[PDB]
Structure 1
Amino acid sequence: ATRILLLVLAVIIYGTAGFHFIEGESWTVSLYWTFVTIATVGYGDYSPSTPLGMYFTVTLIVLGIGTFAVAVERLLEFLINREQMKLMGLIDVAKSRHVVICGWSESTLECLRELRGSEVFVLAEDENVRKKVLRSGANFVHGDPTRVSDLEKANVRGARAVIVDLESDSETIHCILGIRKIDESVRIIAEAERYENIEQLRMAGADQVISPFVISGRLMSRSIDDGYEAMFVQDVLAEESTRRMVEVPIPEGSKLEGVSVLDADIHDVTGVIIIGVGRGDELIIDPPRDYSFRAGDIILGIGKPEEIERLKNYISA
């Protein structure tokens, strides 16, 4: 690593000393001649005439190819080893606004199609997950997501959000409890499996808990007869065939700060069913009549994509 820098400095001290005291040349000439000889440039303006001096140069040339054969084998030992550790995980994340995904399933593959590629780091331990992650454009970190020593290789202290979706609810609770020991302020989004563990995923410290098997178990048992609410959930939340659930923010200015929901009358102007308003980490589903809008709010509503355009200009100034 740095023994190469000494040996390169050794042959400049062997060579310069040899040239100056045999040819009688200057110190600035003896430095200049050694640097065009080790580098195999060789202008030939200051060649050595004496047969002792001709035997000196041969020694310097073999030490020229000598140190260019120790520096090459140290570079190629560095590059084959670094591209092997980088390939099979085994590397430390250095980024600072990335998204870490603990575990890998279909629900995390579906959230890679709405995120960037090089921003996402998948921390898993299986060997088949490594080839699925590299095909999808994310980066693979090899580690146990429940072990706190391996949650720091993924750099979850300087991350934008962490997404936990593991094989059990035992590992999901234990991965949330380990992230909250490192960084108490990072955003954790977690997937529950059983209905009994939605409360234990929140007490462990998840900010958003999503339970897909409990939603899908209710829609299965309520579609045996008619299935009208399963058509609503599938066309608005899953496929977005004709409707879409949007959240739009109210900016500064915004032409409506202060009026009630009755005087604003967003539905009959626009055509968007207003569900609720997002006043700062709470959700008021069906706000009452005398709710007055503020700045920085977020309006959640269902509407056609040609009606959201009629809304996003209605609230902008």
Structure 2
Amino acid sequence: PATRILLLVLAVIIYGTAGFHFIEGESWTVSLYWTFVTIATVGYGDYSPSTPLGMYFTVTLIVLGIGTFAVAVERLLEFLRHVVICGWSESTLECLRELRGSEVFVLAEDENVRKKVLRSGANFVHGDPTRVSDLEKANVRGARAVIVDLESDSETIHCILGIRKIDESVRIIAEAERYENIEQLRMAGADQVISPFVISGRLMSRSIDDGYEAMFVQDVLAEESTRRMVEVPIPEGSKLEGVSVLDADIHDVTGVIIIGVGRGDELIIDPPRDYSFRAGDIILGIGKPEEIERLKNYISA
């Protein structure tokens, strides 16, 4: 019915522009040109509608002059490597703050959010991350990875399954509100789970004494003090491949502290001395950018 009114304002043009070539200077060709020109509150002057009786029909083009302008308006506006964030929460916000330098889409239920999700360098997709149809509104298929944090682990567990139901291989990262659901959250298909509260809690209990243990975690993740925790990959042909951690003395050599090495989906912290670097191996280390750069070279080719 909304597109059925654009037929009445289209008929007024064949009824309003019709009396132009009939009640004035004949021109069945430039008849609509008079109507559109007149209705568009233009009034250039290609026909002042002089006829008196044609002034009565010219008055009709004034009445139905808004029944096509205020009409074709809502009808003209009723046609014409990215990351998706399901759910909009502080976690999400703080996250969107880092991903600022890239294409991010926040899919959320509450519209009121929009305005702010925009104040932060992200695009807003109004929908419910639980409905696959809306997940698609954010194009999860092509999402480099999806971050999920809804109000209740239940809704999150849902959203995940939904995502799976589309691209069953996108990297999904979810926040767990309660420790007791971390596993279900994985079963559902989350690849990585983060439990802000378990971290927070432990850090608390661990800062009753001295708060360095908690000072570490928070400071390291903050873009301050130069020192930066970085994960460096070992190229296929590495002058290390086969070498022992103990033998490479990466610290003495690079200055980059290695807090652990990773074999996709798994990571070891104080890697034992007799550890042997491989190809896909990833180095989790903290260090001055220089040190880092130096570390990359000490491995290159």
TM-score by length of 2: 0.71
Structure 2 unmatched ranges of 5 or more: none
In structure 2, distance between residues paired with 1:168 and 1:36:
57
The Cα offsets for residues 177-225 of structure 1, whole Å up to 9 and x where unpaired, read as: 2222222211110011221121221121110001111111111122122
Cα distance change, pair 16–197 in 1 and its aligned pair in 2 (3 A): closer
Percent identity over paired residues: 100
1:117–1:138 CA contact under 8 A, matched in 2: no
Shift of 1:276: 2.0
Once the two structures are superposed, residues 224-272 of structure 1 have per-residue CA deviations (whole angstroms, 9 ceiling, x without a partner) of 2222312222322345435321101122433322322222121222222
Query: Is the Cα contact below 8 Å between 1:169 and 1:193 reproduced in 2?
Result: yes
Post-superposition Cα deviations, 1:48-103, rounded to whole Å, max 9, x if no partner, equal 9999999999999999999999999964664xxxxxxxxxxxxxxxxxx3211111
Compared with structure 1, are the counterparts of its residues 126 and 37 closer, same or farther at alpha carbon in structure 2 (3 Å cutoff)?
A: closer
Mark the runs of 5 or more structure 1 residues left unpaired by the alignment: 79-96
Cα distance change on mapping 1:316 and 1:2 into 2, 3 Å: same
> Of 65, 68, 89, which aligns to 1:105?
89
Distance 1:127 1:313, change over 3 A: same
**Structure 1 or 2: more helix by fraction:** 1
Which sits farther off after the overlay, 228-237 or 29-38?
A: 29-38
Q: Matched residue of 1:64: which SS? A: coil
Contact residue 275 and residue 300 of structure 1 kept, 8 A: yes
Comparing 295-304 and 99-108, the one that deviates more: 295-304
User: Is the Cα–Cα contact under 8 Å of residues 107 and 138 in structure 2 kept in the other structure?
Assistant: yes
The 1:277–1:119 alpha-carbon spacing in structure 2 relative to 1, beyond 3 Å, is: same
RMSD, aligned α-carbons: 4.9
SS of aligned partner of 1:301: strand
**1:191 paired residue among 172, 175, 179:** 175
User: In terms of mean alpha carbon deviation, does 210-219 or 101-110 score higher?
Assistant: 101-110
> 3-state DSSP class of the match of 2:165?
helix
State whether residues 132 and 162 of structure 2, in contact with CA within 8 Å, keep that contact through their aligned partners in structure 1.
yes
Q: Which stretch shows the higher mean deviation, 8-17 or 218-227?
A: 8-17
Change (3 A) 1:134 1:225: same
1:115, CA displacement in angstroms?
2.2
Q: 1:123 to 1:47 in 2, by over 3 A?
A: closer
> 1:109: Cα distance to partner?
1.9
Question: Is 1:218 the counterpart of 2:177 in the alignment?
Answer: no
Distance 1:4 1:241, change over 3 A: same
d(CA) in 1 for partners of 2:191 and 2:227?
27
